[PDB]
Amino acid sequence: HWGYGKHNGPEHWHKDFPIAKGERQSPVDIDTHTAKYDPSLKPLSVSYDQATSLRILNNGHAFNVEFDDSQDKAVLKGGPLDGTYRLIQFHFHWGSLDGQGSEHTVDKKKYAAELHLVHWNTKYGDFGKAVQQPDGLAVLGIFLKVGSAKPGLQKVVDVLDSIKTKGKSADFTNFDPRGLLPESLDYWTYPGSLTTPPLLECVTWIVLKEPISVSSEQVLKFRKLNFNGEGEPEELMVDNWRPAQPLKNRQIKASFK
Ligand SMILES: O=C(O)Cc1cccc([N+](=O)[O-])c1
Ligand SMILES: [Zn+2]
């Protein structure tokens, strides 16, 4: 099955998921000089005051911080979006070294990591129905750079020892994702896809301009996770990022001058 190795990594995904070579794949390089300011874009509305995290999961590709999405409790709206999108999970992508890890790039710059907050359009009722629609998901992407620690991330880091290997989960209640957000909500937006199989072309991407800072110690604990299951040969969970894909016939719009 798919992964991030030599034999099963991004460059192979198209064999099982031909949409890998589609017209609206993600991530992309954001060319800041050609992304045009769009005055018609709205401020993004991130309403996470009632978010109810439940659990953290090692799915063998990343770890997912999961939310109760059975009511409108943590929603993303505004920005480029029409309607209301409910938070279901967040996860990250990261590198073996601080010089790579992000999926999106900014003028070809790779950040150490990228956080993806995944939301589904309530007009489709559930996640599985939403991913079948071109406006089904809104993913908020946030770059991580290594410097100062992110206090709000530390709860996540400290639980990772308990989900070292694929298929492990742990209770993870009361975690507030507001602690993961940067000061500014300036963003770029474009139409794209999931960045893992099945690579469905269902996402409005909203990539924040301002990275968060995490410490070397924090990212080092991401890199102690394992792709393998308990008791199998250890292969560190690192470089679980898809590289930039062709922009094709897309425009990247900026919310800011
Ligand atoms: O389980 C999976 O890899 C598919 C999936 C599910 C939810 C979000 C995703 N994304 O690319 O942001 C991908
Ligand atoms: Zn992701």
Curated annotation (Swiss-Prot):
Chain sites annotated for binding substrate: 195-196
A GO BP annotation: neuron cellular homeostasis
Effect of residue 61 to G: Impaired activity, not rescued by 4-methylimidazole (4-MI)
Highest classification ranks of the organism: Eukaryota, Metazoa, Chordata, Craniata, Vertebrata
PTM-bearing positions, type Phosphoserine: 162, 169
Effect of residue 89 to P: In OPTB3; in Czechoslovakia
Family: Belongs to the alpha-carbonic anhydrase family.
Co-factor note (free text): Zinc. Can also use cobalt(II) with lower efficiency, but not copper(II), nickel(II) and manganese(II).
GO MF terms, alphabetically ordered: arylesterase activity; carbonate dehydratase activity; cyanamide hydratase activity; zinc ion binding
UniProt subcellular location: Cytoplasm; Cell membrane
Species for this entry: Homo sapiens
InterPro entries: CA_dom, CA_dom_sf, Carbonic_anhydrase_a-class, Carbonic_anhydrase_a-class_CS
Catalytic activity: hydrogencarbonate + H(+) = CO2 + H2O; urea = cyanamide + H2O
Chain ranges of the Alpha-carbonic anhydrase domain: 1-256
SUPFAM superfamilies hit by this protein: Carbonic anhydrase (SSF51069)
Effect noted on mutating residue 194 to F: Normal activity
Annotated catalytic residues: 61 (proton donor/acceptor)
Name by which UniProt lists this protein: Carbonic anhydrase 2
Activity regulation as described: Activated by X-ray, histamine, L-adrenaline, L- and D-phenylalanine, L- and D-histidine, L-His-OMe and beta-Ala-His (carnosine).
